[PDB]
Ligand binder design. Structure first.
Ligand SMILES: O=c1[nH]c2cc(Cl)ccc2o1
Length: 279
């Protein structure tokens, strides 16, 4: 399939070159996979989700997204226009308040929730979790991310937006999950993106158009925006049978565009997520 006039990040993950505007992908489109978006919630009623999104858990007075951040990330995973995996099922877990903040103890509870809740969902092709959040290093937060991964969920986490070494942030610093840095439309490391040996992959993160609350859309930037590209990519590849939750991060690194990004510090991977789709 080909989506013309796609957001640049979509076109980028199906391209060997920057500077194109069509997204190419296999029509299976993540059908039969599921992606948990652990964030501020999802506006599931947005027409862009086509009934494929739902809230499954909140730790606050509402499961509605009063911020927009979770809806934007969910849109990059799987919305019809802005999404990598356009037929995946989306499950929202609201661990962050409407100001985008959440306690680590709630975030941990949300991760253990997904590890169990996947057994209450139909995801024959596999399960992904997208975690566009983090704070300072915590071994308990990292351990929760490792349990979720161990349970058979492909965990993608944001590297963080401090222009710093991601070793000092969690869950970014957990080795067993997929830590995602941010790039821009000219194949430059995003100005804010964290870096370091713990990063596994980069995805599009600067000026990313996606869904927003109020049935709207907007373009925002962050490693929070790169992470759902990788999570949607994993769901898409698992539906194709090319990889599994346990192997998907290594597979995406194996199949990435290599050495194409600028301003990558020495010792940080120079790998850009790529679906390797041949139309
Ligand atoms: O301190 C922070 N803020 C963060 C935001 C994201 Cl998306 C990831 C890690 C973080 O660490």
């Amino acid at each position: 399939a080909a989506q013309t006039n796609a957001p640049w990040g979509l076109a980028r993950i199906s391209s060997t070159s920057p500077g194109t505007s069509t997204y190419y992908y296999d029509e299976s489109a993540g059908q039969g996979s599921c992606v948990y978006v652990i964030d501020t919630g999802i506006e599931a009623s947005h027409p862009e989700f086509e009934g494929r999104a739902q809230m499954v858990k909140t730790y606050y007075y509402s499961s509605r997204d009063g911020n927009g951040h979770g809806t934007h990330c969910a849109g990059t995973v799987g919305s019809r226009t802005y999404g990598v995996a356009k037929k995946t099922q989306l499950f929202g877990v609201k661990v962050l308040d409407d100001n985008g903040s959440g306690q680590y103890s709630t975030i941990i509870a949300g991760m253990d929730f997904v590890a169990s809740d996947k057994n209450n969902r139909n995801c024959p092709k596999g399960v992904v979790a997208s975690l566009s959040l983090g704070g300072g290093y915590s071994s308990s937060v990292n351990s929760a991310a490792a349990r979720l991964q161990s349970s058979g969920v492909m965990v993608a986490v944001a590297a963080g937006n401090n222009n710093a070494d991601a070793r000092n942030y969690s869950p970014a610093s957990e080795p067993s999950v997929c830590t995602v840095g941010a790039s821009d439309r000219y194949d430059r490391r995003s100005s804010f993106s964290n870096y370091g040996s713990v990063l596994d992959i980069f995805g599009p993160g600067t000026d990313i158009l996606s869904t927003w609350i109020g049935g709207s859309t907007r373009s925002i930037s962050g490693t929070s925006m790169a992470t759902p590209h990788v999570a949607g990519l994993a769901a898409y590849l698992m539906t194709l049978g090319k990889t599994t939750a346990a192997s998907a991060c290594r597979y995406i690194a194996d199949t990435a565009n290599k050495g194409d990004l600028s301003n990558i510090p020495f010792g940080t991977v120079n790998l850009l997520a790529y679906n390797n789709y041949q139309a």
